[PDB]
Design a protein around this nucleic acid. Sequence first.
RNA 1: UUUGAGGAGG
DNA 2: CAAGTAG
DNA 3: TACTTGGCCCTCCTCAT
Lengths: 551, 270, 112, 107, 171, 177, 97, 84
Amino acid sequence: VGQQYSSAPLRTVKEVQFGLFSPEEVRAISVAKIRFPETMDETQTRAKIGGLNDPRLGSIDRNLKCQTCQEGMNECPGHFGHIDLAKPVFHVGFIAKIKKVCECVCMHCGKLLLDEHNELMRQALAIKDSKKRFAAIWTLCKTKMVCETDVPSEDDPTQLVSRGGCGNTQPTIRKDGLKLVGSWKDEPELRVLSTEEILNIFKHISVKDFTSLGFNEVFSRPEWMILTCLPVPPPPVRPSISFNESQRGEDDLTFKLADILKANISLETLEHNGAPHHAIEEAESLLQFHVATYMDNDIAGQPQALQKSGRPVKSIRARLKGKEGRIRGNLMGKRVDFSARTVISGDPNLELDQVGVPKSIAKTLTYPEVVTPYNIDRLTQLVRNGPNEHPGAKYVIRDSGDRIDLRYSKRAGDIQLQYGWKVERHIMDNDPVLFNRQPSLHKMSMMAHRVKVIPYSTFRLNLSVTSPYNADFDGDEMNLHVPQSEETRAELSQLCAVPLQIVSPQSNKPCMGIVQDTLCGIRKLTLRDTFIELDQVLNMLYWVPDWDGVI
Amino acid sequence: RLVKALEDIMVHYDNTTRNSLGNVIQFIYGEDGMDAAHIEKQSLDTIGGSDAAFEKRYRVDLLNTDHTLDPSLLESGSEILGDLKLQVLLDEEYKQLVKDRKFLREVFVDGEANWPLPVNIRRIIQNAQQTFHIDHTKPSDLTIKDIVLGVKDLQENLLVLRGKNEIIQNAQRDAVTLFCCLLRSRLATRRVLQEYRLTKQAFDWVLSNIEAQFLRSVVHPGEMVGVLAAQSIGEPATQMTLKKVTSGVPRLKEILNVAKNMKTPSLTVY
Amino acid sequence: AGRAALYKEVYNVIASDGSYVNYRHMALLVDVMTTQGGLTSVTRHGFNRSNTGALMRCSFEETVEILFEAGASAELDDCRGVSENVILGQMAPIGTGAFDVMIDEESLVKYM
Amino acid sequence: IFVYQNNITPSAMKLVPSIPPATIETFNEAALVVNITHHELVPKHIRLSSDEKRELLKRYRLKESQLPRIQRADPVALYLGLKRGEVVKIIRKSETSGRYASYRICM
Amino acid sequence: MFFIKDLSLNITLHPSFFGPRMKQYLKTKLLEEVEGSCTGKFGYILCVLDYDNIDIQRGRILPTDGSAEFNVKYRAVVFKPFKGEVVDGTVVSCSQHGFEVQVGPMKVFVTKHLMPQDLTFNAGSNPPSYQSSEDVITIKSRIRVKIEGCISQVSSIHAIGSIKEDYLGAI
Amino acid sequence: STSTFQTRRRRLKKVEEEENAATLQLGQEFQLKQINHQGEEEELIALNLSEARLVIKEALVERRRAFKRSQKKTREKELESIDVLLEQTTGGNNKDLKNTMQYLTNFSRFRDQETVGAVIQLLKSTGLHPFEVAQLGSLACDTADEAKTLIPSLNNKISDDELERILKELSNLETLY
Amino acid sequence: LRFGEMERDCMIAHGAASFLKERLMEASDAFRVHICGICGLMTVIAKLNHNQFECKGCDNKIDIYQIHIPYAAKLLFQELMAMNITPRLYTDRSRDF
Amino acid sequence: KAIPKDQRATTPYMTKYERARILGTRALQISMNAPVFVDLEGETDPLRIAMKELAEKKIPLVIRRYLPDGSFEDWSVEELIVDL
RNA sequence: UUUGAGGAGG
DNA sequence: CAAGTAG
DNA sequence: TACTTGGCCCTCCTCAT
Ligand SMILES: [Mg+2]
Ligand SMILES: [Zn+2]
Ligand SMILES: [Zn+2]
Ligand SMILES: [Zn+2]
């Protein structure tokens, strides 16, 4: 998939290691300095300034270039960029923990607030469950607010032993908007905790301290919950939308970057100029803002950071949030090709396991068959047949990874097939397909039928296979999926085939029977009172396709 | 939810129901390792019925003029009357059927004897019936040894688990126990010869089939049981189109959420 | 004895409707809810907090929030979860792919 | 084993885990008026020797975690007085196959 | 200096070749994709030893196309120069910047200023060469060099070597 | 590529790749302690010229053999006897091997798999590390200064007199031409 | 047509392993990307021509794999990364079990 | 780890998923121009040939059954009893 | 083209 | 509309 | 105390910025 051969080896993912970015790595990785906030126009001249999107990142305008990476548009995943902030910012989502962390370690020296010495502590440390240690470590010392320099060892509460020092009182902390404040207690002292400081108190936290608290020296050191260097997603993550040429189409994201960028430069241009000391932290909260917003936008501290037009603004997190979004809406469920839908109707002349497929669709849906000595003949006939008569095909693809469009190609009628080539042909009678009716809550809501090319526009299904999908013909529509690999088919025909689903495991009993007319009529036909004469008893016999020809 | 909550659960090649962590959730799928599809409501005759009827149906005494098998049924009838070494196997069979009795009446206090079990024995014999055109007139030809010794030999092959040790080979007897009771129930000498006049041939067949039909009723390591079970429950939930207590759809919600303040707290004390 | 209850109760919620569910299903659920230790709810509060992989519980309710604390605590995912693979585009260890298939070159000579 | 009537002083109770190896357990009168194990619903559980357990594991290829657990404060867990690590075999009736054997480790 | 390291390679075989003599095509293709290869991590892969007992193990079938993939465990003779190692070869080329000696499948170059002083360079010589008080180095003349450094590259490895030390030079 | 019998847990920070020098510090891929397919441990494989020339010819030849088990259904003199064995059992486009055989056949120091046997048995009573135990086998050496200088890793691992004797017994076994 | 979650759940029930994969990949997303053998990222600078590979910052050219995943997932990742979270992709397990 | 051909423990029979997948796989291959190990009594459909190759147990494939703990068991189409 | 709202279908 | 979870 | 996220599936229109 994708096209173009790669000498790289091919493996399947086996592990997913989650980590946090070390400002250093974000750099290493990046290919764009990303200094300007604007998009392109080298003074209106169309291209892209070595500023935002493409100062080497991916590209647009159907052009190979991509730091020689060429490949152009399709085949080239984006290439991350970075953007040196001016001052350290929180991380919308981690703030909660960055907070809890502090309540877990005092500043000035930055070290735990309960060593092997305290016993209640010990137990908390045995719990081999980062999630639960941290959740019990915190509970134990969110309370103690004095960096004890001496504690009664395992002997006499009389003899005092020493460890680390600087008892500097520990301030209780609370969350105000996007910042943390704490009092240091007659009467308190309220000062705002500067990122620049917090960060510093984390860098200093001990390696076995990371560890003791739910962390990991290699992939996630607390000192990374605070953003220094910012990863700048390449185009394919925030593409455009060009209404031809001389117009716009930038993606929502491409904006917050722009804003985060603006709000960054302005900050910096104050520390190397008339720096009105505490008239800066009034524009530093703007960077903390934007950079927070660009990721999360549905917060408690109201301000939604509305985009000109009052339109909310799509925070990255938004994209992933359940249903309709990435995870659930794109990966756990996608739209798919080789599918079709119409209105079902009953038909007492179709084996249980069949399905009437309207010629229309059969000519539309296709199956990729591999040119083989077994079929060459039959296949070449379908190919010559063109994509208009029914039994035919509509695409021939040769080993040379290039598709021949059967309806145009000046050689449409020509073509000798080559053992190995593939000929996408029409769906034919007896092509196993996965049929179904939503809502799907049964193994049975989906079953494999034998395709039956038929006239008129509907999926004509047998009656007895009705109740399983649980459907009637009152305008009820249905879905059909066409397999693609000899083995795919097999899977449908070998486990999804309707004749298999006859006995329901969800109630250890059959889940299909005889209903309506055939049911009603079978009773009438039964009755001792009911007798049938020759002429008819003969026609009836002829109808059971397996009649032994014995009146 | 039910679904997301059980996706990852499937029967593993060891015949254990685990998830993606491999945490055993059931040691044998459904406490019996049977594929739901191969199960039908059979009846455990060994349960219901007066202690009286129980004797007149399964008791065989070769040391008694009125409690021995009328030689009109067994070929070697008359020549068995009295044989002591047989009455030991005959007594063994009976002491068992009885143990079964007390066993079943200990797992199903209701007295309900109709339950879902693999291998439909009632039919598996019926077919044996007209398959060998068996005439209720002439006598069978099954040694008493033929029967009771073969029945024991069948149980040996109804393997659900395989294991080369005790813990496992012990679980075996467990996961099978119930079925067997139904087996001994239907293959008790008196029945086999007086109710369904099997011939050695018919018998050796009915046996051969139960064994094979059973081995087929076992669950397949792979079966994505969780989702199955999930659906199997949330499906009948949508079909819920709705003596005075919290009940139905809302009840189910109450249950899954593991709620503390159920509308109906109630409590039955006997 | 609790499992007994939980099940007995669930059963009755399907019985009151004249429906039938083969033990095993309700048992399995009653069991999943019980094993871990006591009553684990079929909610983002219970089951979706257990040791399961991140990507998995991530495809249900707490999504982004769940992920965040994953890279934060450098979580590691097995990719033994149906979901995991579905997200990855790899055949999941389910039925068909609950085992491997190989060409025994040896037997591949006795066949000629 | 100590049977209090209405309750013990929290000053008191904080003296049980202070003389190992030995061990102590506290039970309320009103909690022992009826033996719970006698209940229609409670199936019989059984302690497993450090051996019988090491066997079980090795016989299912199980890691300790993967085993269904029982609360250290679970009613029955005190009726037998388990310990964080001891495994219990629970043999109960089953409407699918007469008897089903399940195990419960202790947390 | 030369080695006999134990390696393994991965070949993905198309169903087509799932014949009777597969072991054959496998081995054979193994050879086409190893003998003549060069890695910085393994140096020069020169020859596959014990051709006959190459381990194939069972190959598994991938899962979208019948292709099967085998983890062929072999063993062979390799050779990768090092800094500080000393080997002697046959000079090949020679210029106003030095001469290049050829040690085995590789080629090591010697800078005019990395060799002794009393050794000038003769331009008007045919073939080109370097002259000394008593020594004369040209095309075929056999030298013995000390590899000062190595530079891996593509499907080959080069290195610069000095003959300014003692016990080095011609022979 | 071609995986090497040993999966090092490269946990992100792939930084520390020391230098390569006759300090006997060869890329981790050549620790004097490596692993054999059988899963056992096994000393590195020190192959000195002419000892290799034999090994190569050994398989290259025995290949020509098993190569025809499936076909039924003096200096300048060996330069030719080999150019043939190649154009039969080699990739032909392995111009590296051609050159390897020349170099390995011109500069080689032995002809008999016997003589080469003694070379080995002799040098293998040292306790010396494979690399040395090879450089010693393929490099002429008259004085111990010449040796312990053209193989600096020797220096303190053997008295000059000793290493001298050994050098004496080399030129003594050094097959003629 | 959309192959919603439910549809997936059914296929899982069936054990339609391969079919499911297929619906999800070949018949929709399916994309080929390159990873670093070191930091399980999509950094890799695959020039798929002059066979060049690299992935500086980790600096490679030798240890590089190629994988097939849903373009959506590709995105999922990149998106996560832009949020400063690293989803490592490793082609082999080291945690055993 | 690997499990001996002896001491083997799984089902002597073939799981439907195995059967299903092997016929699928084998079919894919036959359809890929792989070699066919039976006399096509004139058959021309791969999954049909696979069906035959499987009835004469002339399928060169081997099922590696993995266990929850990681160790597996290897079985050949030959061995595996094909009830169904 | 994306998006956001309303109406409808089983 | 609610219940639970968590600060 | 207060608030937070959960809210059938799929499909089809039209409208407006
Ligand atoms: Mg309707
Ligand atoms: Zn690019
Ligand atoms: Zn301090
Ligand atoms: Zn990298």
